[PDB]
Amino acid sequence: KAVSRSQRAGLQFPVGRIHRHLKSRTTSHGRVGATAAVYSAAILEYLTAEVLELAGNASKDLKVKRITPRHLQLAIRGDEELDSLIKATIAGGGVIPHIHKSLI
Amino acid sequence: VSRSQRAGLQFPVGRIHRHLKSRTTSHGRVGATAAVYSAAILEYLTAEVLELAGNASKDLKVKRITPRHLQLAIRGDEELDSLIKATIAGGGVIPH
Amino acid sequence: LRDNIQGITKPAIRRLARRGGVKRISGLIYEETRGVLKVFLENVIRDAVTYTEHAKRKTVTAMDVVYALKRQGRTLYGFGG
Amino acid sequence: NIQGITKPAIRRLARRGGVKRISGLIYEETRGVLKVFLENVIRDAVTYTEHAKRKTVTAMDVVYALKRQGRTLYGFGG
Amino acid sequence: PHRYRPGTVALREIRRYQKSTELLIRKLPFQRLVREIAQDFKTDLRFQSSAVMALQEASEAYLVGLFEDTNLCAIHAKRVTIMPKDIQLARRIRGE
Amino acid sequence: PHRYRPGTVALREIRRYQKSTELLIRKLPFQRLVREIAQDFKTDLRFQSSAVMALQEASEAYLVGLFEDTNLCAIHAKRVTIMPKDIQLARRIRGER
Amino acid sequence: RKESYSIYVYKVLKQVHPDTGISSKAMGIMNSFVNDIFERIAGEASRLAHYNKRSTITSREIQTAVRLLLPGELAKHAVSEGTKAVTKYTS
Amino acid sequence: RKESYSIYVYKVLKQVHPDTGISSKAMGIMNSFVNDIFERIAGEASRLAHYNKRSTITSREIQTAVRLLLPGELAKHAVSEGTKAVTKYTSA
DNA sequence: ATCCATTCGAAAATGATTACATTCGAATCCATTCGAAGATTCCATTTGAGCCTGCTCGAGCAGGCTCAAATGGAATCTTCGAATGGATTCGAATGTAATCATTTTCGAATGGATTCGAATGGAATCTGATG
DNA sequence: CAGATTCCATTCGAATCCATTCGAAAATGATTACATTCGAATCCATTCGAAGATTCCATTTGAGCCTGCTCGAGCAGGCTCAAATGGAATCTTCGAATGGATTCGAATGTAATCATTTTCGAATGGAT
Numbered sequence: 002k003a004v005s006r007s008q009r010a011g012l013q014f015p016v017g018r019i020h021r022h023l024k025s026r027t028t029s030h031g032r033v034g035a036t037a038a039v040y041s042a043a044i045l046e047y048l049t050a051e052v053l054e055l056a057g058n059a060s061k062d063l064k065v066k067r068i069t070p071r072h073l074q075l076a077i078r079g080d081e082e083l084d085s086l087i088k089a090t091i092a093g094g095g096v097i098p099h100i101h102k103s104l105i
Numbered sequence: 106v107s108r109s110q111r112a113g114l115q116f117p118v119g120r121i122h123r124h125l126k127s128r129t130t131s132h133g134r135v136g137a138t139a140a141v142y143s144a145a146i147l148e149y150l151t152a153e154v155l156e157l158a159g160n161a162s163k164d165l166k167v168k169r170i171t172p173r174h175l176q177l178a179i180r181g182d183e184e185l186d187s188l189i190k191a192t193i194a195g196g197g198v199i200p201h
Numbered sequence: 202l203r204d205n206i207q208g209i210t211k212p213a214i215r216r217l218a219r220r221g222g223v224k225r226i227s228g229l230i231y232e233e234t235r236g237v238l239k240v241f242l243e244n245v246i247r248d249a250v251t252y253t254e255h256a257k258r259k260t261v262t263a264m265d266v267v268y269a270l271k272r273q274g275r276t277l278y279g280f281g282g
Numbered sequence: 283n284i285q286g287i288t289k290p291a292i293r294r295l296a297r298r299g300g301v302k303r304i305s306g307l308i309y310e311e312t313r314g315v316l317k318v319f320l321e322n323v324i325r326d327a328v329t330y331t332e333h334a335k336r337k338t339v340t341a342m343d344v345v346y347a348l349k350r351q352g353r354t355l356y357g358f359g360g
Numbered sequence: 361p362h363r364y365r366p367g368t369v370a371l372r373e374i375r376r377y378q379k380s381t382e383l384l385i386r387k388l389p390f391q392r393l394v395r396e397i398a399q400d401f402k403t404d405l406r407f408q409s410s411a412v413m414a415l416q417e418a419s420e421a422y423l424v425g426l427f428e429d430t431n432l433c434a435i436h437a438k439r440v441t442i443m444p445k446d447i448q449l450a451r452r453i454r455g456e
Numbered sequence: 457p458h459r460y461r462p463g464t465v466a467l468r469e470i471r472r473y474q475k476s477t478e479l480l481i482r483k484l485p486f487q488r489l490v491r492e493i494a495q496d497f498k499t500d501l502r503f504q505s506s507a508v509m510a511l512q513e514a515s516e517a518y519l520v521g522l523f524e525d526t527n528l529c530a531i532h533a534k535r536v537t538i539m540p541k542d543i544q545l546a547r548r549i550r551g552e553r
Numbered sequence: 554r555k556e557s558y559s560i561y562v563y564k565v566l567k568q569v570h571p572d573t574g575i576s577s578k579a580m581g582i583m584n585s586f587v588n589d590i591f592e593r594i595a596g597e598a599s600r601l602a603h604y605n606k607r608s609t610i611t612s613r614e615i616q617t618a619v620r621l622l623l624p625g626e627l628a629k630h631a632v633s634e635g636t637k638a639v640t641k642y643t644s
Numbered sequence: 645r646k647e648s649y650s651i652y653v654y655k656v657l658k659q660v661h662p663d664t665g666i667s668s669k670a671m672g673i674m675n676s677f678v679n680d681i682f683e684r685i686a687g688e689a690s691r692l693a694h695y696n697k698r699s700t701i702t703s704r705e706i707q708t709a710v711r712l713l714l715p716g717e718l719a720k721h722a723v724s725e726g727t728k729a730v731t732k733y734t735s736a
Numbered sequence: 737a738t739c740c741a742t743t744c745g746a747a748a749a750t751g752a753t754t755a756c757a758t759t760c761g762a763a764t765c766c767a768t769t770c771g772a773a774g775a776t777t778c779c780a781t782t783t784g785a786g787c788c789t790g791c792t793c794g795a796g797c798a799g800g801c802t803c804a805a806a807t808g809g810a811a812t813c814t815t816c817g818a819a820t821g822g823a824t825t826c827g828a829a830t831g832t833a834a835t836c837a838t839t840t841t842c843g844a845a846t847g848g849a850t851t852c853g854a855a856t857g858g859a860a861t862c863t864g865a866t867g
Numbered sequence: 868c869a870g871a872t873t874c875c876a877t878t879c880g881a882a883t884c885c886a887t888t889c890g891a892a893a894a895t896g897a898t899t900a901c902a903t904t905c906g907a908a909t910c911c912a913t914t915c916g917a918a919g920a921t922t923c924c925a926t927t928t929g930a931g932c933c934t935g936c937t938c939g940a941g942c943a944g945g946c947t948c949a950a951a952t953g954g955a956a957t958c959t960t961c962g963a964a965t966g967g968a969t970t971c972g973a974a975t976g977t978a979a980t981c982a983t984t985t986t987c988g989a990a991t992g993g994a995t
Contacts (some may be wrong), residue, residue, distance in 0.1 A: 003841075003894050010642040013564045017893050018556075019591075023610070026595045029127050031602075032609045032833055032902085036639050040615040041594060043638035044631050045587060049565050052586070056579075057570040066852070067574040067883085070279070070582055071381055082625045089589070090421050091582060092279030095381040096220060100374060103435060104224045106752080107983085112733040115655045119751050120647070121682075125701070128686050133693075134700045134759090134975060138730050142706040143685065145729040146722050147678060152656050154677070158670075159661040168994060169741085170666045172357065173477055175673055184718050191680070193673060194357030194513050197477035198298060198520060202396040208389025212782070216384040217420070218442075220377040221427030224370050225441040225791085225944070233444050234423065237451070241422055242397055245415065248712065250401045255708045256696055259964070260771085261398075263410035268695070270418055272712070279578065280414045282585035283492045286485030290924070294480040295516065296538075298473040299523030302466050303537040303802075303933085311540045312519070315547075319518055320493050323511065326621060328497045333617045334605055337822070338913080339494075341506035346604070348514055350621070356676040357669060358510045362869060366790070366945045368864075372871085386781095388954060406771065406964080429549055436545055437533045439792080441944085449532055453525055453549045462803045462932070482923090484812055502822090502913060537802085537933075554844050554891080574883070609833080609902070645749080645986060665741065665994090700760075700975080 007042070014042040055080060070094050109144070116144040157182060172196050206235050245269055284313050323347050383420060390416055426450065479512060486512055522546065558587050594618050612639055649678050685709050703730055 006016040020038040027033060055076035060068050074094025077083050108118040122140040129135060157178035158170050165174070176196025179185050214234050218226055248269035253261050263280045270277050292312050296304055326347035331339050345360045377384070391412050398405055426447070433446035473480070487508055494501055522543070529542035547553045562583050566575060597618035602610055612635075619631055653674050657666055688709035693701055707726065711719050 003839090005841090005894080006642075010638050012638060013561045013568075014558075015561070015893095021892090022591070023595060025131055026599060027131055027610065028599060028603070029129060029131075029133075030608055031131065031599075034609060034611045034833075036612045036642065037598075037610050037615050039639050039642045040612045040619075040635040041591070043635040044594070044615075044619060045590065046561075046565060047631055047634045048590060048627075049562060049583070049587065050569055052583075053562075053566050054569050057566075057573045060573060066572075067576055068579050069576050070578055073579055073582055082627050085624050086627070087586070089276040089278045089585075090418065092277065092417050093381055093578060096378055096424060098375070098378045100222060100371070101431070101435060104222075104440060105371070108733070108752085111736050112729050114729060115659070116649075116652045117751095123751095124682070125686060129690060129701060130694075132699065133690075136700060136702045136975080138703045138733065139689075139701050139706050141729050141733050142703045142726040143682070145726040146685070146706075146710060147682065148652075148656060149722055149725045150681060151653060151674065151678065152660055154674075155653075155657050156660050159657075159664050162664060168663075168665060170664065170670045172669050172673060175670060184715050187715050188718070189677070191354035191356045191676075192513065192517050194355065194510075195477055195669060198474055200471070200474045201300070202392060202399065205389065205393045205396045208393060209385065210782070213385050216373075216377055217423050218427050219370075219373045220384065221424050221431060222374060222378070223427055223431050223442055224367065224374070227441055227443045228944075229444055230442060230447075233447050237426070237447070238419060238423065239397070241419065242394070242415070245418070246394070246398050247401060249411070250398060250405070251708065251711055252695075253405075254402065255692065255704070259404070260406040260408065261411045262408055263414050266411050266414045266418075270414075275418060275422070276589070277414065277418055278582045278585045279417075280410060280581075282588050283485070283489045286489060287481060288924070291481050294469075294473055295519050296523050297466070297469045298480070299520045300470065300474075300527050301523055301538055302463070302470070305537055305539045306802075307540055308538065308543075311543055315522070315543070316515060316519065317493070319515065320490065320511070321496075323514070324490070324494045325497060327507070328494060328501075329617065329620055330604075332498065333601065333613070337500070338502040338504065339507050340504055341510055344507050344510040344514075348510070353514060353518070354680070355510060355514060356673045358506060359672075360676055360679065361947085362865085363946065364864075364870095366788095369946075386954065408771080432545065432548065433532070436529070436541070441791080445532070449528065450549060452528065453546060457805085460804065465804075482812065504913080535934080556844090560843070577883085607903085647985080651985075667741080698761085 006038075010039050010042070012039075012042050012046055014046050016042055052076065052083065055083070108141075112141045112144070114141075114144050114148055116148050118144055121147075154178065154185065157185070206239060209235055209238065245273065248272055284317060287313060287316065323351060326350060383416060385416065385420065387412075387416070390419075429454070480516060481512065483508075483512075486515075525550070558584055562587075593622060597621060649675050653678075684713055688713060 007013065010016060016038045019041055020033065020035070023033045023037060023041070052073075056068055056072045059076045059079075060066075060072045063072075065072075070091055070093035074091045075097070077087055077091070078097050109116065112118065118140045121143050122135065122137070125139060125143065126135050154175070158174045161174045161177050162168070162170055172193050172195035176193045177199070179189050179193070180199045211231055214231050215226065217234075218230075245266070249261060249265040252265040252268055253259075267277060267281050289309055292309055293304065296308075323344070327339055327343045330343040330346055331337075341358050342360065345355060345358055348355050349360075391407075394412055394415060395405075395407070398407075427442075429450040430442050430446045433450050434440070434442045437446075490508060490511055491501075491503070494503075523538075525546040526538050526542045529545050530536070530538045533542075544553070559580055562580065563575070566573070594615065598610055598614040601614050601617055602608070616632060616635065619635070620628055623631060650671055653671065654666070657664065685706065689701055689705040692705045692708055693699070703726070707723060710722050710726070714722060
């Protein structure tokens with residue numbers, strides 16, 4: 002029979018497709034090992050799970066069942082490391098409420 | 106009959122072709138007139154910078170060129186200042 | 202088309218300032234805001250039209266804008282990638 | 283060892299920067315800023331050194347780390 | 361007649377516009393402005409709708425960030441009013 | 457005895473240190489500081505002279521630029537004396553805070 | 554037909570929060586995020602391989618490239634997860 | 645062995661300023677500058693080729709990369725110089 | 737006086753020419769999405785004008801605190817010199833990633849049934865301002 | 868005491884999740900070379916120790932220039948209301964422009980054989 006490589010590694014993200022994608026970015030004569038794909042898939046899955054967990058907590062706070070870009074922005078900008086890593090613009094997020102003490 | 110002499114340049118065309126061929130992902134080809142264009146651009150930029158630095162040296166009444174002259178020339182031109190944002194080791198600061 | 206920069210009214214600038222967190226506003230802020238907006242738009246649109254012209258096309262797509270914004274250092278999530 | 287960056291050295295750097303008068307609490311702030319910058323750069327220099335299985339920190343590791351940070355430097359091999 | 365002291369409705373609008381997520385500029389004037397600006401680079405162009413909307417989102421985010429920096433600079437000088445000097449200083453420090 | 461008013465020698469020092477190109481921090485203390493900082497990441501390390509020189513040049517350039525921005529912030533608030541709040545504001549606007 | 558990361562993002566989400574859904578715009582944002590991070594890691598790995606005059610890319614290059622560009626405790630946890638995955642795979 | 649751009653920089657300098665020399669440190673700085681610009685142009689050209697689903701790199705890619713990277717009034721002169729060189733190469 | 741920038745001589749990479757083999761990207765036609773130009777209403781948003789209050793600016797005093805000068809004296813700089821430590825090169829012997837040929841499992845596009853947030857319709861507090 | 872903002876109820880309509888057909892692609896099995904790893908052999912280049920003349924640095928004192936707090940005048944931005952205006956929104960038609968197929972024809976890589984060309988040694992007389 003056939004056993005997928007992601008099942009052997011114990012992941013959800015694909016190992017074969019990521020291997021094929023990595024082989025297309027090597028300059029000129031360049032080979033790619035079989036255990037670079039496993040490392041890359043594990044990294045991507047870890048980061049995805051972290052962001053999704055924070056966003057789900059933010060959504061649960063507001064008594065809502067689904068996730069929207071507002072919750073993604075609230076989750077990202079409330080964490081120091083995620084804020085440092087992600088500096089892009091999220092279309093539909095807005096700003097975190099904050100009013101200076103001198104103006105009040 | 107070298108390619109550089111046929112195009113009328115001083116920078117190398119074969120060496121630049123070889124350099125370009127080694128940064129083109131997988132199964133990527135490089136034309137023969139990309140090297141000529143690249144060599145022309147590099148020669149033009151080098152000549153501009155050298156001309157400005159030499160004018161500054163003639164202003165300062167010296168014969169050679171030092172990193173101080175390069176810093177003075179680069180910081181005094183708007184386009185060169187915008188393009189080059191690196192640190193020249195031995196230039197100082199522009200008086201102001 | 203002429204003097205289209207005056208369609209960025211004074212209430213719109215006031216709303217953007219309020220979302221920024223500003224309590225009081227002077228009377229000469231609006232012209233400065235219009236100037237800075239024009240400069241930003243000119244840069245981005247120039248790069249987007251260059252990207253479109255390279256591909257031998259006549260329609261400006263969302264991906265040219267996304268690529269230009271990534272070039273300037275202003276990555277945007279939501280419209281492609 | 284951070285106290286070996288004295289007060290006259292900071293005065294000289296401020297004078298070259300254009301400053302006419304200096305407060306008395308500037309020196310500790312400047313020392314903190316310098317320490318943070320140095321740690322940030324040396325971390326990546328040592329990472330680059332360790333990847334190549336070496337025990338000596340060369341000039342190219344520092345040049346690459348600076349270029350990564352966004353502070354390109356000319357005249358030291360790149 | 362009922363009146364509010366100067367400065368209460370301002371805080372009400374601050375909360376209202378910081379709690380929401382929509383766009384704050386009208387769409388037709390912005391589209392007209394985009395077309396007029398792009399008239400100078402190539403004649404007889406066409407635009408998707410997504411291109412205009414991406415441009416609007418980027419512009420709004422840029423202006424909001426700039427106004428936050430301007431407010432910081434205005435607070436530094438012991439004021440609550442923002443003036444063109446704060447915009448100029450904020451843009452100068454950011455290297456713009 | 458002869459005395460100088462405070463403010464002219466400052467301008468003389470400004471001109472003198474802006475016309476030159478040398479280094480302003482002494483070498484042995486900076487070398488010791490660099491080694492002590494780097495001992496946190498790996499033990500029994502070695503350095504080249506060029507590494508320390510590159511680090512010194514980069515550090516000096518960074519500090520001079522920061523002090524220019526600090527002076528701008530000090531002038532904004534109608535002063536000539538620079539204080540820590542100016543450094544904090546400059547670093548906050550730049551993106552480091 | 555075109556490729557996307559929607560299936561795996563939904564699988565991870567159902568693994569973390571088993572009763573919370575996702576919309577369609579948040580899916581586009583997650584797709585863009587994954588592509589961005591992948592391109593960053595790939596570029597850094599290629600440069601690292603170039604510096605030492607080698608042609609092949611291995612898990613050492615990926616580990617070093619993760620040690621850069623990833624701040625704080627993210628780097629430690631990511632390296633731990635990747636090492637565990639590779640160790641399980643090879644055996 | 646170790647290749648560099650010293651000979652060509654000296655030739656250009658003797659072309660523009662026939663009576664001026666150049667020291668070693670300025671030569672190192674010029675080498676760094678040339679390498680930096682070349683790497684920038686090459687990367688941008690590769691990205692342009694990728695975006696359009698092509699495989700070959702031609703003078704169109706280089707021209708567009710130059711237009712994207714160089715500031716105004718510096719792109720016009722560079723484009724003119726490159727076009728003249730390519731035409732002279734092809735005609736001969 | 738002293739450091740160094742330009743010349744001269746050889747030798748080992750390494751471009752330049754000729755001849756295929758074959759990817760690869762121009763040249764014409766045809767469909768379809770898709771963007772531009774017109775037309776017709778409500779109704780919400782923008783534009784002036786009047787009123788009045790609170791925030792910004794300038795001046796006279798007072799206290800805080802940075803700078804300029806003189807005297808020790810200490811610690812960075814320059815030169816000399818072993819001891820040895822670790823990068824760098826050259827060979828054989830391995831480890832493993834690429835390339836065909838099959839077979840089948842997987843993920844992408846199109847349809848269909850709940851279902852959960854998006855407008856009304858109120859009621860209950862919260863808060864602001866003049867007395 | 869008059870305005871504004873946070874709670875619950877009810878019917879609705881936009882939106883997500885599950886089901887199906889089937890092409891595009893991933894895993895298995897041999898066979899080759901290609902690239903990386905494991906021992907010696909120089910031999911530079913970093914670290915440690917010593918001597919000392921001198922120049923930077925640290926401490927104390929005096930005083931005047933800069934900053935901070937109080938007060939009064941005025942001036943420029945906020946708040947309310949009536950009248951007018953231009954955006955949104957819901958169809959209709961038309962015409963300009965991509966995107967996919969099928970042949971071709973222009974152009975690049977690969978393999979040998981020279982015939983240059985650039986980098987590594989000292990050698991001096993010259994700007995600093």
